[PDB]
């Protein structure tokens, strides 16, 4: 996104580095924060065939899918509202991560200007 | 130069672990791709052998 | 058959982009030699082509009423249900 | 405008830019001009052949079998020794030869130390 | 084998005695019978070789090579009977004592049990040759190049023959059993060395290697077309056989000093195959070619592993029955033009339809296509060969993109291309000369079913 | 200047023997002399059924060589190859392999004869 | 397509001369010598060769093209080059 | 021979409009650059020194040679063409039909036989287009590449045979 | 207005 | 020799034109469109981007579970 700039051209001390973030502990500052679950157990989730990229928290919103896919064959225009329930819970995966990628960007400024604020007046 | 620029696309695709999106673009490209060469082959064809974009023109009617 | 070859006499400049030419060429004071020989590329059913968007809608004139009597159906069907 | 069309061994300068057509002298007409007269002789001559009735056989082009004869034998004959030649057998020759020894040498003394000490697994590679 | 020398050596008296012109057809009817006896020993037993008698055996590796040069004995008959038409009876008979004779010494040679009896009839064929390239050649440079190839072969058949005598003496037997089962370490020493130098170079020159090669050139371009296939089809690898054979004893001292061999083949075949590139005679441009192939033979011997040794037999025995074929090819045009020059009779396609494909076919087999035997054994030694050195690839498969050039390259300057307008003499393709043409390619594309029979004596 | 008068000759001379050359490569009515050869009894028995050339014919020529073509090239064929992969690689293993039939949580396995246990409750993620 | 016959040829020869306003109309023998009668430049027969050539799609080289002079000339040089044998 | 500067500025108009042709495209753009083309070379048309002419053609042949278009219109059916010797691969020539079979030699009667009778006029008339040639050399060889005519009656131009007798450009 | 094909003899 | 030539040829004129290319070119032309505007109606969402994309500014640092300043 923007931040692109705002790291290369940018300081890039402010900005996070995708391929090591997180970097300081996630829990430390977050009150009990819920651990997350996932009810496709794993000997059905291997015997779906799942691709491993695929094979996410939300990749329960597949099994059915398949399901209604696999049944409601030859009818391909059918197994929409399923499919969309998949994507929006795609959705909600994902937007799980600009908020961890925020709050390790907010981290970021916080410990920064904490820094040279608790050593300035010394 | 226009199908080696679609198969330029398909690699990038496969670049950033997208292989069988690349072969979803081999069927659709397949498709249309195939059918503007006879295109050409029939006016080509039609104007004795005329394949220069220079000498054409007025065949939308 | 035989193949008879048009005209002579209905082949000029008018009506063309030629005389447009022509009269610039006239204006700097030349004559010019091939003027009537494209005429046809121009005259007779060769006139009036399509612009290029235009061309990009060909057939619009009935999609647009294609679409029409299908959403009428799905409203139909909606109403139905 | 536009600097000139400097040309090249790969790219030849064209003949309508060249200075030979565009300053000329009478000698120069005269030794050109009977250009086609020496073609002629050979044009002339390989058509009577070629639409003699009688000849039932092929045309051989004495041009042709020179030019194989001087790409096969009139070569070692015709050969001279020279610091040229003789740096140029080397060099095209033995040369390689010996540069593919030492990249080749080396890189049997990298793998053969290599697996000695047991820094390459083939755990899997069998068959050789 | 007795059942197929016997055979051969009673085509002898066939033959002189035969009938005034039914010389050729009788010489044929048999020779083609002869090979199809010869077809009986191309099974083999588990591990140990076939053997017959005290000085005959054969194996995995002599048996493949027996049918190739028993079945070429009718081919080289047909061939040659086109311009052989126009002479004595004596002399016709004498050619057809003299292919008989040197297919006897062939056979003998493969399947002989003890080295020294190897080494008399791999240098005796010699004799049968050089009288063919010498009496009954077309050119004049075949008074040279008969004594460039008899003296290369013999420069370093002769150190081979004191080497052998000395494993005589002191080893004992050299029969080619008694050799494998008592092989003892050949311990890196200067002695060992030229002991190692004299029992290879023999074979090396007949190969040819990369630089011991110039007798090819020569030989098989002024040689007659009866000669032009066996000094390319079947004793180069006689060579072949020869290293095959002797190194069960050169071990370890072969991987310290195979370096200058590999160094030469694996590098000179990019300059050989680059002569084919820019050639003027198309003879020349085939026995190049055979030359790069051979070279590739030579580099596969060395490493002495099982994948080399398979990929050395199927491009040797495919090379063979591809180098042949291509030789008549080049006989057909020089029948007809009267000259060897590639750019004299451009254009072949266009008059005679079915030459071009067999020259496709021709040109195909020496690119080595998949699956065909060339590919299936150059790709193995590639493979051999990279495990041996992960550099050589770019080498090994260098040719194999140079090949392609030059392999397509006669195929474009003959055949692809307006024919010359001059030349007014081609005739309509004889039915000897496609029905001969058909007799090479057939088994080579048959051949592909089973690569197990050709695939050498460790399959 | 302009074509030479003697050159103007050669033309000429040139013209009219290439237009007769050409007039002569042509082709009379009767060639090609075509010697016949034996005619399969089918052709016959066609020719003397499509006197009419209505759709009566119509139709059963189009679809008999059309009918013709699948048994000679779709039936027969794939009977050899059917013969081939029941039969003969059958019965040797690892010949003919698939991935396992990607079953899920639900529909009941043919031969085990058991339910697979369904997942649990989502969390009402709806949208 | 039926094969561009001499007659076809010379009715599409005087087709382009006549519709050429620097030659009249009434002035058009098939034999009209361009230089001796018309008297265009010597530049303008270089120039109408190239409607010719358009005209049927071909080339006349620079060679042949400097002497092809007269109406029948044209349909001469363009019905030998393309095979034209009535 | 020896290309006279009149011939070659001619050369110079007809190839520099055809490369125009592939810079204007469109037929009207064609038709003025070329008046404006062809007036800017009669301008300058009275030149008395031949030198001059030259030195005029001494910045032209620049003024094409980086003015051209680097994919010029030409016409298939020549160099460069994309027509060019498309079907060549079929122009058998005629003297390979002397070895035909003779059942397909009898297969076309009518013209075989024809084709034996030019085969006999061409065998008469040979040796007669022979002494036409050295009765009319030059003194010391053929001095042109040109060919002289027939020059009596019942002859034959000389060297006929392959320009009459030479396949058609369509022979499929 | 068909024509002859000069093509090469094909029936060996 | 025979006929067999629907259209005719045309010298500097307009080519003869049937009935059977016009309406064909029409009918798919024209229903080229039609699925054009079907699917945009029945899926526009594919398009457009269904699914929006919150702005990070506006995640205030309580449920991103950032501890103040002050700390
Ligand atoms: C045309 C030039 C040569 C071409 C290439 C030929 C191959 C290169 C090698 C040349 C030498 C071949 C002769 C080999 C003879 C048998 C080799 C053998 O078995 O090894 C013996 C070693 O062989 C030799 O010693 C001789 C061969 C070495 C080279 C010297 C002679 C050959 C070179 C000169 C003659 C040939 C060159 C041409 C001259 C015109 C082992 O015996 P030993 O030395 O251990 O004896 C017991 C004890 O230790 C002391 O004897
Ligand atoms: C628009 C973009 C263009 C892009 C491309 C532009 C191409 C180059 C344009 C510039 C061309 C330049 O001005 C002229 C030159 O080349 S050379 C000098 C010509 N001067 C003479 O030749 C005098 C002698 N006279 C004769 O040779 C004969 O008289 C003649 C044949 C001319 C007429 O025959 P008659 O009638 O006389
Ligand atoms: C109106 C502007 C639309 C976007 C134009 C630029 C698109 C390419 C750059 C942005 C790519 C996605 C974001 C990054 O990360």
Not at chain 1, 66 to 80: G, M, Q, T
Not at chain 3, 56 to 65: N, P, V
Not at chain 5, 424 to 440: D, G, P, Q, V
Not at chain 8, 17 to 40: I, P
Request: charged share 20%.
């Amino acid at each position: 996104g923007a931040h692109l700039a705002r790291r290369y051209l940018g300081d890039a001390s402010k900005e996070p580095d995708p391929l090591r973030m997180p970097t300081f502990p996630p829990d430390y500052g977050f009150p009990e924060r819920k651990e997350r679950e996932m009810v496709a157990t794993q000997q059905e989730m291997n015997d779906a065939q799942l691709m491993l990229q695929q094979r996410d928290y939300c990749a329960h919103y597949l099994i059915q899918l398949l399901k209604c896919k696999r049944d409601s064959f030859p009818n391909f225009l059918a197994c929409k509202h399923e499919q969309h329930d998949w994507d929006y819970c795609e959705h909600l995966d994902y937007v799980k991560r600009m908020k961890e990628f925020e709050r390790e960007r907010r981290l970021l400024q916080r410990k920064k200007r904490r820094e040279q604020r608790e050593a300035e007046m010394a | 130069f226009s199908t080696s620029s679609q198969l330029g696309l398909m690699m990038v695709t496969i670049g950033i672990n997208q292989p069988h999106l690349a072969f979803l673009h081999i069927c659709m490209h397949a498709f249309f791709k195939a059918m503007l060469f006879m295109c050409s082959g029939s006016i080509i064809h039609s104007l004795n052998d005329e394949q220069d974009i220079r000498k054409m023109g007025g065949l939308y009617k | 058959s035989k193949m008879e070859l048009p005209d002579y006499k209905q082949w000029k400049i008018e009506g063309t982009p030629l005389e447009t030419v022509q009269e610039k060429l006239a204006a700097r004071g030349l004559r010019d030699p091939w003027g009537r020989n494209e005429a046809w590329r121009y005259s007779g059913g060769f006139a009036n082509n399509v612009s290029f968007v235009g061309a990009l809608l060909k057939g619009f004139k009935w999609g647009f009423a294609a679409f029409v009597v299908a959403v009428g159906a799905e409203y139909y069907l909606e109403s139905q249900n | 405008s536009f600097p000139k069309y400097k040309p090249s061994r790969l790219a030849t300068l064209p003949a309508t830019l060249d200075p030979a057509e565009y300053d000329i002298s009478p000698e120069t007409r005269k030794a050109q001009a009977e250009r086609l007269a020496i073609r002629s002789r050979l044009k002339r001559e390989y058509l009577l052949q070629y639409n003699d009735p009688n000849r039932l056989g092929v045309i051989e082009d004495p041009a042709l079998i020179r030019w194989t004869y001087a790409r096969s034998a009139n070569i070692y004959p015709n050969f001279r020794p020279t610091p040229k030649t003789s740096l140029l057998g080397a060099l095209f020759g033995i040369g390689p030869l010996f540069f593919w020894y030492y990249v080749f040498k080396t890189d049997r003394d990298k793998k053969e130390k290599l697996i000695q000490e047991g820094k390459l697994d083939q755990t899997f590679n069998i068959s050789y | 084998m007795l059942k197929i020398i016997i055979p051969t050596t009673m085509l002898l008296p066939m033959t002189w005695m035969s009938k005034h012109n039914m010389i050729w057809i009788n010489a044929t009817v048999h020779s083609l019978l002869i090979s199809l006896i010869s077809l009986s020993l191309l099974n083999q037993l588990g591990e140990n070789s076939l053997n017959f008698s005290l000085t005959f055996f054969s194996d995995s590796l002599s048996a493949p090579l027996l049918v190739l040069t028993t079945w070429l004995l009718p081919l080289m008959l047909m061939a040659s009977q086109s311009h052989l038409s126009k002479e004595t009876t004596t002399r016709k008979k004498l050619y057809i004592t003299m292919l008989i004779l040197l297919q006897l010494f062939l056979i003998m040679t493969f399947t002989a049990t003890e080295l020294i009896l190897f080494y008399i009839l791999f240098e005796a064929t010699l004799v049968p040759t050089l009288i063919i390239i010498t009496r009954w050649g077309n050119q004049t440079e075949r008074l040279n190049a008969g004594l460039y190839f008899l003296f290369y072969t013999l420069a370093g058949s002769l150190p081979l023959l004191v080497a052998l005598v000395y494993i005589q003496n002191t080893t004992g037997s050299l029969n080619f059993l008694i050799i494998h089962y008592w092989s003892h370490p050949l311990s890196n020493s200067w002695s060992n060395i030229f002991m190692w130098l004299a029992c290879i170079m023999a074979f090396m020159v007949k190969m040819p290697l990369y630089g011991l090669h110039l007798w090819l050139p020569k030989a098989h371009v002024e040689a007659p077309i009866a000669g032009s296939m066996v000094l390319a089809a079947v004793l180069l690898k006689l060579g072949g056989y020869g290293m095959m054979r002797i190194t069960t004893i050169l071990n370890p001292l072969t991987n310290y000093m195979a370096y200058p061999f590999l160094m030469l083949s694996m590098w000179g075949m990019i300059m050989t195959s680059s002569i084919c590139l820019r050639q003027t005679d198309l003879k020349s441009l085939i026995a190049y070619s055979s030359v790069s192939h051979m070279a590739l033979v030579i580099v596969a011997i060395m490493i002495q592993t099982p994948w080399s040794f398979m990929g050395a037999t199927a491009l040797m025995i495919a090379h063979g029955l591809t180098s042949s074929m291509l030789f008549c090819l080049a006989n057909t045009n020089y029948e007809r033009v009267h000259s060897r020059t590639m750019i004299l009779a451009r254009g072949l396609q266009t008059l005679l339809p079915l030459m071009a494909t067999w020259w496709l076919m021709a040109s195909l087999t020496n690119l080595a296509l998949p699956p065909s035997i060339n590919l299936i054994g150059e790709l193995f030694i590639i493979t051999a060969s990279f495990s041996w050195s992960n550099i050589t690839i770019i080498l090994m498969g260098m040719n194999m993109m140079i090949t392609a050039l030059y392999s397509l390259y006669m195929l474009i300057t003959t055949q692809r291309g307006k024919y010359t307008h001059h030349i007014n003499n081609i005739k309509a393709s004889f039915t000897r000369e496609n029905a001969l043409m058909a007799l090479h390619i057939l088994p080579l594309l048959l051949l592909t079913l089973n690569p197990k029979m050709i695939l050498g004596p460790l399959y | 200047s302009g074509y030479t008068p003697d050159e103007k000759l050669r033309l000429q001379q040139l013209r009219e023997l290439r237009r007769r050359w050409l007039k002569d490569q042509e082709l009379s009515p009767r060639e090609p002399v075509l010697p016949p050869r034996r005619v399969w009894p089918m052709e016959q028995f066609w020719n003397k059924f499509l006197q009419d050339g209505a759709p009566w014919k119509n139709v059963i020529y189009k679809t008999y060589r059309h009918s013709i073509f699948a048994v000679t090239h779709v039936l027969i064929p794939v009977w050899i190859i059917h013969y081939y992969l029941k039969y003969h690689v059958t019965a040797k293993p690892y010949t003919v392999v698939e991935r396992k039939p990607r079953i899920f949580p639900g529909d009941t396995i043919l031969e085990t004869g058991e339910v697979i246990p369904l997942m649990k409750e989502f969390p009402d993620q709806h949208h | 397509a039926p094969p561009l016959t001499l007659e076809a040829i010379k009715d599409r020869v005087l087709y382009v001369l006549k519709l050429y306003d620097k030659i009249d109309p009434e002035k058009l023998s098939v034999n009209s010598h361009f230089m001796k009668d018309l008297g265009l430049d010597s530049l303008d027969q270089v120039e109408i060769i190239m409607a010719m050539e358009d005209e049927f799609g071909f080339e006349i080289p620079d060679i042949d093209a400097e002497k092809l002079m007269c109406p029948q000339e044209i349909v001469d040089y363009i019905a030998d080059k393309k095979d034209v044998y009535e | 021979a020896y290309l006279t500067h009149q011939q070659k500025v001619l050369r110079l108009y007809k190839r520099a409009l055809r490369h125009l042709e592939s810079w204007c495209v469109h037929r009207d753009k064609y038709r003025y650059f070329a008046c404006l083309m062809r007036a800017r070379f009669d301008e300058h048309k009275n030149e008395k020194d031949m030198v001059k002419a030259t030195q005029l053609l001494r910045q032209a042949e620049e003024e094409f040679w980086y003015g051209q278009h680097p994919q010029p219109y030409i016409f298939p059916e020549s160099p460069g063409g994309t027509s060019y010797e498309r079907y060549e691969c079929y122009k058998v020539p005629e003297w390979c039909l002397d070895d035909w079979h003779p059942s397909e030699k009898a297969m076309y009667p009518d013209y075989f036989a024809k084709r034996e009778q030019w085969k006999r006029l061409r065998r008469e008339s040979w040796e007669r287009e022979v002494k036409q040639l050295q009765e009319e050399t030059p003194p010391g060889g053929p001095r042109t590449e040109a060919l002289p005519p027939a020059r009596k009656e019942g002859d034959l131009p000389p060297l006929w045979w392959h320009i009459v007798t030479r396949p058609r450009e369509r022979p499929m | 207005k068909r024509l002859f094909i000069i093509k090469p003899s094909g029936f060996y | 020799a025979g006929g067999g030539v629907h259209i005719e040829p045309r010298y500097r004129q307009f080519p003869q034109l049937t009935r059977s290319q016009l309406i064909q070119a029409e009918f798919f032309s024209a229903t080229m469109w039609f699925w054009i505007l079907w699917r945009f109606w029945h899926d526009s969402d594919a398009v457009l981007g269904h699914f929006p994309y919150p702005d990070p500014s506006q995640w205030t640092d309580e449920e991103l579970g950032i501890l103040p300043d002050d700390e």
